[PDB]
Amino acid sequence: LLIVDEEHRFGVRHKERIKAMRANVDILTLTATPIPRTLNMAMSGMRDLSIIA
DNA sequence: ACCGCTGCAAGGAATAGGATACTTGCGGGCTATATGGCGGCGAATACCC
């Protein structure tokens, strides 16, 4: 299990750096204002989404 | 009971990379000052009576 908190301050490289080593790790991602790339990626179905408002 | 040594602090530069805004390089898409040709003719001045 990985838990990247406040993902919008890392960049793509830092986010998949650990993913490359452990290919099948379960990435949990917490944030409040996602950077547009990962927000579109979530809204397009690539990643599951959960809204807490 | 003096002294050279060791060790525990002090003193910070250069990059990665996500930001934020500057700086400009450009390309398409616009606006805006002579000196080697005559011949003929009719009309417009000049003039000196």
**CA–C1' gap, A43 and B34, in angstroms:** 77
Experimental method: cryo-EM
Whether the beta carbon of A8 falls within 7 A of nucleic chain B: the reply is yes
Tokens of A50: 């959960």
Distance of alpha carbon A18 from alpha carbon A4, whole angstroms: 11
Q: Which regions of chain A does DSSP assign to beta strands (E)?
A: 2-5, 27-30
* Residue A16, amino acid: E
Whether the beta carbon of A4 falls within 7 A of nucleic chain B: the reply is no
Cross-strand partners of A29: A4
Distance of alpha carbon A32 from alpha carbon A5, whole angstroms: 10
**CA–C1' gap, A37 and B11, in angstroms:** 43
By the 10 Å C-beta count (0-12 exposed, 13-18 middle, 19+ buried), A40 is classed as exposed
Can you give the resolution of this entry in Å?
Answer: 4.3
What is the torsion angle, in degrees rounded to the nearest 10, for the CA atoms of residue A50, residue A8, residue A47 and residue A30? Answer: -40
